[PDB]
Design a protein. Sequence first.
Length: 48
Amino acid sequence: LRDRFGTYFDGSMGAAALQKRLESFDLDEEAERLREIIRTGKGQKKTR
DNA sequence: GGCGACCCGGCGCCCGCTACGGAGTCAACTACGGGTAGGGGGTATCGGGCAACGCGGCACTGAACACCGTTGTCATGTGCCTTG
């Protein structure tokens, strides 16, 4: 994946990847989308 | 394709204190090079031991004046005797 094409996707491994993800994580839109899911949802997906 | 059991992991705990034993353990080597640290050697600096010598009360120095006290002393005033 790296060799055939680059400068498009950034990848990593270990806790550094998690730190990068949480740094750029946008929890507000996740909360909004999960509220939308809760409004119209069924099953154990609702509990998750 | 969410329900469903079931399965599994995964975890959570599991009366109270005193008082009451010990035990302690298996597989390299040398060469160099520095640097610190020790030792003694010698040296500038700080600290300890004594009589004059600062003081002060008073004391002596009485010496030299002062303070009353005293019998020195004087020239000058009453009382009796002699003469106007």
